[PDB]
Amino acid sequence: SLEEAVTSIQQLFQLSVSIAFNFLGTENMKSGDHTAAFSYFQKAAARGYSKAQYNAGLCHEHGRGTPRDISKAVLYYQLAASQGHSLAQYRYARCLLRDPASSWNPERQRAVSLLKQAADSGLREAQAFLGVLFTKEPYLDEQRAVKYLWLAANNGDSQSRYHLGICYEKGLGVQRNLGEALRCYQQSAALGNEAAQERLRALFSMGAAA
Amino acid sequence: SLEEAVTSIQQLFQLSVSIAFNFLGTENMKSGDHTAAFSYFQKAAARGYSKAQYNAGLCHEHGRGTPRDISKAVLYYQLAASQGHSLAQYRYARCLLRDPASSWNPERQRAVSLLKQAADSGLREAQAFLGVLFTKEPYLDEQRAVKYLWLAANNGDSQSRYHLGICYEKGLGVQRNLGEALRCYQQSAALGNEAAQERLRALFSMGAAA
Amino acid sequence: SLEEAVTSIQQLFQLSVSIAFNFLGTENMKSGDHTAAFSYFQKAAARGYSKAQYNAGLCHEHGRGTPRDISKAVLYYQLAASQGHSLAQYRYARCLLRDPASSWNPERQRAVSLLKQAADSGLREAQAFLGVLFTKEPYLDEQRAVKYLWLAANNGDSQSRYHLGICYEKGLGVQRNLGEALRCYQQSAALGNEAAQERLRALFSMGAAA
Amino acid sequence: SLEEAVTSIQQLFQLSVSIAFNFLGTENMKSGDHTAAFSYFQKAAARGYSKAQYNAGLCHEHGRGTPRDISKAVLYYQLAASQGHSLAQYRYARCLLRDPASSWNPERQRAVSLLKQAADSGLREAQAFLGVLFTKEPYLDEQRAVKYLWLAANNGDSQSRYHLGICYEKGLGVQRNLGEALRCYQQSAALGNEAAQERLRALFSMGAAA
Amino acid sequence: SLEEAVTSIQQLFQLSVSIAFNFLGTENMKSGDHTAAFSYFQKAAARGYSKAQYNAGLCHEHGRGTPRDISKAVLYYQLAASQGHSLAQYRYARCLLRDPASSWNPERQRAVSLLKQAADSGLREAQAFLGVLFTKEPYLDEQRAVKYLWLAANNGDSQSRYHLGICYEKGLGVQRNLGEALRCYQQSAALGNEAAQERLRALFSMGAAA
Amino acid sequence: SLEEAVTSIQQLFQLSVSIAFNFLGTENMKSGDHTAAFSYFQKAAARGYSKAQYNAGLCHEHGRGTPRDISKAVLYYQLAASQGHSLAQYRYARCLLRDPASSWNPERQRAVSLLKQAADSGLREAQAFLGVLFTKEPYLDEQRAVKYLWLAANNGDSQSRYHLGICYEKGLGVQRNLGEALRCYQQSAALGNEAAQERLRALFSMGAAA
Amino acid sequence: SLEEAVTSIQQLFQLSVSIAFNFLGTENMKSGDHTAAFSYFQKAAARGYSKAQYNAGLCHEHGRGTPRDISKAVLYYQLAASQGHSLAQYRYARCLLRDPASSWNPERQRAVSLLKQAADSGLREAQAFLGVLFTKEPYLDEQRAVKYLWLAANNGDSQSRYHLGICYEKGLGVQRNLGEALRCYQQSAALGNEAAQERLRALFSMGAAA
Amino acid sequence: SLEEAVTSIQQLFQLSVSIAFNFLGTENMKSGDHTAAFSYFQKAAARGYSKAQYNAGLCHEHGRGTPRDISKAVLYYQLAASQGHSLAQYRYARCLLRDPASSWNPERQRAVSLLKQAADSGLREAQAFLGVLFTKEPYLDEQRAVKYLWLAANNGDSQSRYHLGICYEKGLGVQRNLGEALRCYQQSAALGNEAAQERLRALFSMGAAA
Known part of the structure; x- marks a missing residue:
């Protein structure tokens, strides 16, 4: 029964280090340090975490320590929204729908549907x-x-x-x-x-x- | 008791002929005859009756059977208003005050005061x-x-x-x-x-x- | 001054006998006698009286003692409406607009106009x-x-x-x-x-x- | 002295491993891995935890990675409801009352009573x-x-x-x-x-x- | 011509003497004399007059100077109601329907019908x-x-x-x-x-x- | 039938001459003549008429042509209120209850009772x-x-x-x-x-x- | 240097063992084990913890596994209320005020004051x-x-x-x-x-x- | 990977010891010990933590264990407000602006702006x-x-x-x-x-x- 135990403990260690990196990063951002905050959120989002991906997108499209970029920002927003984060999918849809372009492209329908099911939550x-x-x-x-x-x-x-x-x-x-x-x-x-x-x-x- | 009786009966005759002439006049106006209505109303107003003076003024200011006149119309309206006919004094004030002239003269103040008194009656x-x-x-x-x-x-x-x-x-x-x-x-x-x-x-x- | 006096007295006699005929007719109708009501109302309306013509039309179109008729009723109603009787012109428009025929005839426009300026009174x-x-x-x-x-x-x-x-x-x-x-x-x-x-x-x- | 300490620490260890397995399982379900979530929730509910039992019932009734089952689902729901979980007991009652069967069976009596005391919470x-x-x-x-x-x-x-x-x-x-x-x-x-x-x-x- | 004129004038004389008798009756009642009021109202109602019959019924059912009597009052109210007097017919209905008897007797049928068509007038x-x-x-x-x-x-x-x-x-x-x-x-x-x-x-x- | 006829005609003459005297009084008051209006109103009120007594009281308590007098005014108001005149009894209350004296005298109770049965009329x-x-x-x-x-x-x-x-x-x-x-x-x-x-x-x- | 560190760590250890014992106890109570919950809550409240003292008072006043007692219950409630626990002080006041005794005793004065300041929180x-x-x-x-x-x-x-x-x-x-x-x-x-x-x-x- | 790991772990240790010092500080404040609460809050705020600085300012401006001081209190409040603590920034603004002086000094403008953006939060x-x-x-x-x-x-x-x-x-x-x-x-x-x-x-x- 030790094999499932060791798999569980290593997966818990992965999740816990992701949590710690995210928390660190947000503490640094609140305190005032920004470049370390960017590094922390990037390395936390590199391993599949929801809130970390949201904050990475937020800092990378506000540009509070990195030149203003939208491509990788909306990529992070997509990766966070797929996991079920309300704010992340709101930001993704608002950033993708900022253009007055037509809705023929399917990604627009996907974005409006995800914004709809976000608004269903109560934000x-x-x-x-x-x-x-x-x-x-x-x-x-x-x-x-x-x-x-x-x-x-x-x-x-x-x-x-x-x-x-x-x-x-x-x-x-x-x-x-x-x-x-x-x-x-x-x-x-x-x-x-x-x-x-x-x-x-x-x-x-x-x-x-x- | 004959002197007071004869005075009363002659005054009753005056009032009754006034009433009859005014009536006749308004019956003629309603029926359709107009010049006879004008003559009847004028001779009824010439002997001191309120409603007769109102009708004379009205028929002189609308001119429904006589060329348009405001002078005689307003004089007849003054006579009708002095005796306490609410609609008559309303018509007097409206016809006299319709001019854009100044109100320095006290006669305009008298007109607006009598208009106030008419409106206090409920018209x-x-x-x-x-x-x-x-x-x-x-x-x-x-x-x-x-x-x-x-x-x-x-x-x-x-x-x-x-x-x-x-x-x-x-x-x-x-x-x-x-x-x-x-x-x-x-x-x-x-x-x-x-x-x-x-x-x-x-x-x-x-x-x-x- | 005798000529105007005699003209006035004969006009007063005409109008007063019309009043008497109308009053006696309506009293007979209210009491219960009907054929006498028709006779009185017809002889009163034959000499130019508004309410008498109204009552003649009413008794000709209800037929309260005479076979139902419309032509005589509508003619009497027109003659009464021309003299300024609210109920008379209301009933005239009621009896003239009841048909489903076309309104190409200008008499329909006249009827609707008189109905309008009747209802403007407050009926x-x-x-x-x-x-x-x-x-x-x-x-x-x-x-x-x-x-x-x-x-x-x-x-x-x-x-x-x-x-x-x-x-x-x-x-x-x-x-x-x-x-x-x-x-x-x-x-x-x-x-x-x-x-x-x-x-x-x-x-x-x-x-x-x- | 040490005996109560060791009993307390071992009971705390059991509770903590239950908590960790539940948290893991829900993290895997939110992330996207499903069969691991099923295994984790099953082994967490096998040792007497409320939320773990609710999640096991939910994953057995929706079957989001396991063939649809209502028997094991409602058994887990009962085991979770007996411990005082509002949403779990709501789910149990709504699953047991979906049939049009009569309320002669007293299992329905406990089901309706537990639904009542669940709704008393404010869900x-x-x-x-x-x-x-x-x-x-x-x-x-x-x-x-x-x-x-x-x-x-x-x-x-x-x-x-x-x-x-x-x-x-x-x-x-x-x-x-x-x-x-x-x-x-x-x-x-x-x-x-x-x-x-x-x-x-x-x-x-x-x-x-x- | 002569015959219709004389018939009209004699009927008018009948109506006028009825009016005068009723007016003297009501003037005596208002002034204070009462037995003369009974005499005048009775002789006025004896010749077919509406409000005279109503007043006769009123003075018979209050007995304002005559012993209380209902049968005569009820008959006078019937005569007044048949001629179209709203207040008189209301009095008739209220006097006849004071009994707790059933509505099988058709006299109650006329009573309730006339009270209905009286209340429809606005009393x-x-x-x-x-x-x-x-x-x-x-x-x-x-x-x-x-x-x-x-x-x-x-x-x-x-x-x-x-x-x-x-x-x-x-x-x-x-x-x-x-x-x-x-x-x-x-x-x-x-x-x-x-x-x-x-x-x-x-x-x-x-x-x-x- | 001559005796009742002559009594009726003489009573009608009495009432009609009272009406005429009152009408001349009010016509003179409206026209502007005042002393003649006073004389007519007194000679009408001295012979038993309600409205004439009201007008006599009004002209004695305003004194619009005769020195102010309250004794004769309130006596005329009493005579007029005894016959059922709303304004007369309201003015009687006006002129009697203005005193700051005590209400021990039953005449004050009679005054307030007549005021009550006046206000019940709708003034x-x-x-x-x-x-x-x-x-x-x-x-x-x-x-x-x-x-x-x-x-x-x-x-x-x-x-x-x-x-x-x-x-x-x-x-x-x-x-x-x-x-x-x-x-x-x-x-x-x-x-x-x-x-x-x-x-x-x-x-x-x-x-x-x- | 090290002295403040060791004092801080030992105080943290005392607080943490209190927290753990309270959490244990409440987990046992929710799960179903009761006497162990009583022992855990008692030894957690014996060392000065607010929520533990409230739970001890609750388990002594309901007696869900211990004979009913109000004395120890209210003593624990007082000891919990002195530390600023809203629900505990509410329970203390409601338990002490259940008697119909007078408010001469100042213990009632503190009880009502603490209930007031508890209700000021929003319970x-x-x-x-x-x-x-x-x-x-x-x-x-x-x-x-x-x-x-x-x-x-x-x-x-x-x-x-x-x-x-x-x-x-x-x-x-x-x-x-x-x-x-x-x-x-x-x-x-x-x-x-x-x-x-x-x-x-x-x-x-x-x-x-x- | 050693350098980033050691930097992360040391920053986490600093933040965690700050958290622990604040936690023991508030535990002492709630329990009743005050001088230890002061010492813990001061040593927690000396190393850059937000609500620890808020608590230090609170304990210096109420003086619940230290003589009344506003200087150090408002300095700690400034440090807490700059880091994004809504209630602390409220306290800083209200403590600085309690003086009735004018708004010429830029510190008042900064205080009112931060109070504005605090009120916009929802306090x-x-x-x-x-x-x-x-x-x-x-x-x-x-x-x-x-x-x-x-x-x-x-x-x-x-x-x-x-x-x-x-x-x-x-x-x-x-x-x-x-x-x-x-x-x-x-x-x-x-x-x-x-x-x-x-x-x-x-x-x-x-x-x-x-």
């Missing part, structure tokens, strides 16, 4: 971005966009709720109502959505005053 | 007219304007309550509120105020169109 | 009639129909308010609101709309509880 | 499932079913609140209300109940459309 | 009495009773709306709702329905703070 | 006056005062509704509620009440910085 | 218990009792909100409101207050049923 | 304190103050709710609403904001009802 940013993405060409699906924008806005995001308000006012996906749109704009401006909410409130409060 | 039009009046130079009194505009709007006038809404959104006399103004615009659209809705709803919907 | 039935009429071909004007149906239903008519409810539910002229339509149906059935509100409640109950 | 799924279960024969207990459906739907489940709405509409256990039921259907369709709420909305649409 | 008391009567054996029609109780209570009658509240809380005709019944009792106490509303509030306080 | 001012009166010593009856203040304020009187607000905030007769009291103050001051505005702005607006 | 049970406690003699402090009952019931406790409802009806510490109290009773019965809310609903049912 | 006290901060000279920026007071009051802080109410009633930053301000006062007094809310309720009670 605030993923579902808000999904609601934004499904509202614009060529991902037009008004009902799902509305429902996820509303669900994200219920968590307290000002911009998502302003987008819900413009969705009501423009009358796409939801019946064209104006009073709820006005109160939504007012509360979004109250919650400190400076640019868009302030601009729309000022326009509506000046069109009849100028 | 729908006088209240709305003074609500419009007090918002324009030099009759600036915002609180009274708002209160009587609201009182007239409670009777169901679309224009008066649209002016209440414009007052809310512009924030004069009342704290500057937008949601109540929007619902007021919407309900004024519901009652069919063409000039109000067909401009305000279009201006608040032009923002939706891109 | 309950004319408003509901025009609200129904403008909803059907070829008088399609959704906004006016909705507004007058609403201000008619505000007076407490169950059928007009049920028609407002179906207007909301079907989403013609107003945005397709559904909860308001359900509440309107329910409180129409509360006021005793025996047929319509009850049958929609039953249809949405039996076909909803399965 | 979303168990409460909704029991709310569904108590509605159908022979578990009829309307008040408790409605209360647990309501408090489960308060957590944001679309199907639970849709079933609350159908409970309102059919009026079983709750006073028959219809407007709030319609609002509940509408919001559940808004929250993304793609099948059921949308189907009832369409039914209430085509009910009057055709 | 306050008739509606409330019908709402009460349809609630009690053998006139049980819950929906009609509820709808007239509500319509009468809308006019501001305190006792009718207290009956509406008792009907709602007892759950006949309308489903059992409690909060609305609670502030229905509260407003009925506020509007001065001292007896019933005070009793219900006192009971609801004694059984609560016991 | 606006009498109810507001009794609502003020029952609040102050020794007429303390809080419930009735509140109920009739509320019912009168429902008619739109600003002072009565401000008194309703003071009653709410002070917590006499009603539960001491502040939010409804603040609102009530707000719309009372909105309708142009000097006292309500001067109380609100000095209590809940000045106390902030004073 | 549901302690706040509800103090809300119950301050209502009854001699701990009468109505405002604080109501506020803590309200904020505890906001967490979803049925009995706490039922006691809030009673507080509303009896009107102690809060302005006596009845409609909101009825709604609170109804919702608490809906949330599953099987005994008390249902009993009051039945009482308010049979109060009018019989 | 309850930071947002409330910053809402208070921006209200007073020279940090006047009303919108941010209003939004942070609103968000903090949404978390249940009574004083923040009172300051929101004072902001509404005083009409700075938000429109001068008074009704919802009174409701805010009342329901903040319900939560137990004894001093200020009780003071305002007493001022609005004595000045109004006395």
Whole structure:
């Protein structure tokens, strides 16, 4: 019975050293050391760990100690997302979908599906971005966009709720109502959505005053 | 007892002939004969009757059977208003004050005071007219304007309550509120105020169109 | 001064005998005598009296003691409506618009215009009639129909308010609101709309509880 | 002295090796290796651990690397539930109650009791499932079913609140209300109940459309 | 010509003497003389007049100067009701239906029908009495009773709306709702329905703070 | 039949001459002649007419053409109120209850009873006056005062509704509620009440910085 | 140098053996072994650990494997509460306040103070218990009792909100409101207050049923 | 591989001994030993650890075992804040900015910026304190103050709710609403904001009802 024991202990040692390298790295990043943080996260992600791959991608696309790169960054994000990390797949989808390119390529469908199943978890940013993405060409699906924008806005995001308000006012996906749109704009401006909410409130409060 | 009896009976004869002539006149006007109605109303008003003076002024200012005249119309309206006919004094004030002339003369102040007294009697039009009046130079009194505009709007006038809404959104006399103004615009659209809705709803919907 | 006096007294005699004929006819109708009511109303309406012509038309189109007739009834209703009687012109439009024939004749436009400027006075039935009429071909004007149906239903008519409810539910002229339509149906059935509100409640109950 | 120390250290060693094997197994399952995860979970559950027994039951009922089995799955689920694991006992009850068999067998009595005391903890799924279960024969207990459906739907489940709405509409256990039921259907369709709420909305649409 | 004119003038004289006799009767009743009121009203009702018959019935059933008599009052109310007097027919129905007898006698059929078509006119008391009567054996029609109780209570009658509240809380005709019944009792106490509303509030306080 | 006929015709002559005297009095008062109006009103009121006695009391207590007198005024008001005139008895209460004397004299009880049966008719001012009166010593009856203040304020009187607000905030007769009291103050001051505005702005607006 | 190191390592060893014994003990209790759990918890609490002392108190007051004792239970609870354990101090206060003895003994003063500062943390049970406690003699402090009952019931406790409802009806510490109290009773019965809310609903049912 | 391994293991040892020293420090603080807690926290913070520095600052500024000092306290707070400790950076900002001096010194700008980015994290006290901060000279920026007071009051802080109410009633930053301000006062007094809310309720009670 010692063979399974030794296999178990060596696999546990592998996993534990991965954990320790990741924890070290994040402690260095929080403390202030960065190049050592990059080295630690790279050598931790080289051996198949989820959070390590996420942080490697995060530091390698923010470039907090390495020139700004996206290719290897999104490769790390893919490798982390395949293992079931919510933030990793959110970042992967947001980085791959930043272009206005068409959705004919299958990797776009894969990215939007993984972002969808990420937003199913409950992360605030993923579902808000999904609601934004499904509202614009060529991902037009008004009902799902509305429902996820509303669900994200219920968590307290000002911009998502302003987008819900413009969705009501423009009358796409939801019946064209104006009073709820006005109160939504007012509360979004109250919650400190400076640019868009302030601009729309000022326009509506000046069109009849100028 | 014969002297008081004969005085009473002759005064009754005067009042009865006044009533009969006014009646006849209004029956002729309703039936379709007009010049006879004019003559009847003039000879009824020449002998001191309130409603007869109102009808004479009305038929002189609309001119529905006599060339348009404002001088005699306004004089007859003055005679009718001095005796306590609410609609007559409303018409007097509206016809005399329709000019954009200054209110330095006290006679205009007398006209606006009698308009106030007429509106205090419950007439729908006088209240709305003074609500419009007090918002324009030099009759600036915002609180009274708002209160009587609201009182007239409670009777169901679309224009008066649209002016209440414009007052809310512009924030004069009342704290500057937008949601109540929007619902007021919407309900004024519901009652069919063409000039109000067909401009305000279009201006608040032009923002939706891109 | 005798010529104007004699003309005035003979006009007064004419109008007063018309009044007497009308009053005696309506008293006979209320008491129970009917053929005398026809005779009196006809001889009163033959000499140019508004309410007398209304009653003549009413007794000719209900036929409460004379065979049912339309041509004489509609002619009397036209003659009475020309003189400014709200009920007269309401009944004229009711009896003229009841046919399913084409509206190429301008008399139909005249009838709808007089119905409109009748219902603008405040009569309950004319408003509901025009609200129904403008909803059907070829008088399609959704906004006016909705507004007058609403201000008619505000007076407490169950059928007009049920028609407002179906207007909301079907989403013609107003945005397709559904909860308001359900509440309107329910409180129409509360006021005793025996047929319509009850049958929609039953249809949405039996076909909803399965 | 030393005897209690050695007993404590050996018991701690047994517990720690159980913990390590469970952690290993779940790390392998998350990473992607499966058969090793099955072996690890099996040998961890063979020595009396709660979460390990739950994971063994889960991997035997989904069969993500082992032929589908319910017998061993439910045995492991029972062994995990007896030790106080909320999600495991929820799974046990939902697996044992999937059959349409009667509740004469007292194993069903313990199953429903353990599901009840699991839902008392606050898990979303168990409460909704029991709310569904108590509605159908022979578990009829309307008040408790409605209360647990309501408090489960308060957590944001679309199907639970849709079933609350159908409970309102059919009026079983709750006073028959219809407007709030319609609002509940509408919001559940808004929250993304793609099948059921949308189907009832369409039914209430085509009910009057055709 | 002569014959129709003389018939018209003699019928007018009959009507005018009836009017005068009724006017003297009501003037005497208001002034304070009562036996002359009985004489005038009796001789006025003896010649076929509506409100004269109503007043004769009123003075016979109150006996404001004549021994209490119901048979003559009931006959006079019948004569007044047959001629189309809303208040008189309401009085007839309420006087005839005071007995707890069944509705097998068709006299009760006419009584209830005329009370129905009187309450349809807009009188306050008739509606409330019908709402009460349809609630009690053998006139049980819950929906009609509820709808007239509500319509009468809308006019501001305190006792009718207290009956509406008792009907709602007892759950006949309308489903059992409690909060609305609670502030229905509260407003009925506020509007001065001292007896019933005070009793219900006192009971609801004694059984609560016991 | 000559005796009853002559009695009827002479009584009709008495009533008709009273009506004529009152009509000439009111026509002269409206026209502008005052002493003749006084003479006619006294000679009409001396011979048993209700409205004439009201007008005589009114012209004696305002003194619009005769030196101020209260004795004759209140005597005429008593005679007019004994016959069932709402305004007459309300003015009797006006002129009698103004004294700060005690209510030991039963004539005060008669005055308040006639005021009660006046307010039961539906006049606006009498109810507001009794609502003020029952609040102050020794007429303390809080419930009735509140109920009739509320019912009168429902008619739109600003002072009565401000008194309703003071009653709410002070917590006499009603539960001491502040939010409804603040609102009530707000719309009372909105309708142009000097006292309500001067109380609100000095209590809940000045106390902030004073 | 080495001296501080050896002191630190020996103190860490004491703390770690305490932690391990506590963890062991709770693992044995959850697994099913009890007397070993008692021994482990006893020897862990004998050396000054907070959670171990709480568990010792719990196992001495429930007696799930040791004869029931309150003396040692409350002594352990005090020793755990002095170190800052919220649930332990809640248990101490609830065990010491179960007697109906007076608060003359200052041990009750510390007990109530520690319960207060425990409830200040946010535990549901302690706040509800103090809300119950301050209502009854001699701990009468109505405002604080109501506020803590309200904020505890906001967490979803049925009995706490039922006691809030009673507080509303009896009107102690809060302005006596009845409609909101009825709604609170109804919702608490809906949330599953099987005994008390249902009993009051039945009482308010049979109060009018019989 | 020896050099990277030895560097990793030595860095891990340094971090682990820092963790252990902090753990024994907090264990001593909770147990009751204080001077040892001070020594351990100081030697842990001397080697660069975040929450150890926070605890050192806390023990120097409360002085729970050392004479009161702010200098070393704020230096340790700066060291902890620079490393990303939300609560520590709150404490640093609040301790540095307690002085009433101006914001000319850049250290105040740094403190307010770090407090801003602390409040943006989600800490309850930071947002409330910053809402208070921006209200007073020279940090006047009303919108941010209003939004942070609103968000903090949404978390249940009574004083923040009172300051929101004072902001509404005083009409700075938000429109001068008074009704919802009174409701805010009342329901903040319900939560137990004894001093200020009780003071305002007493001022609005004595000045109004006395």
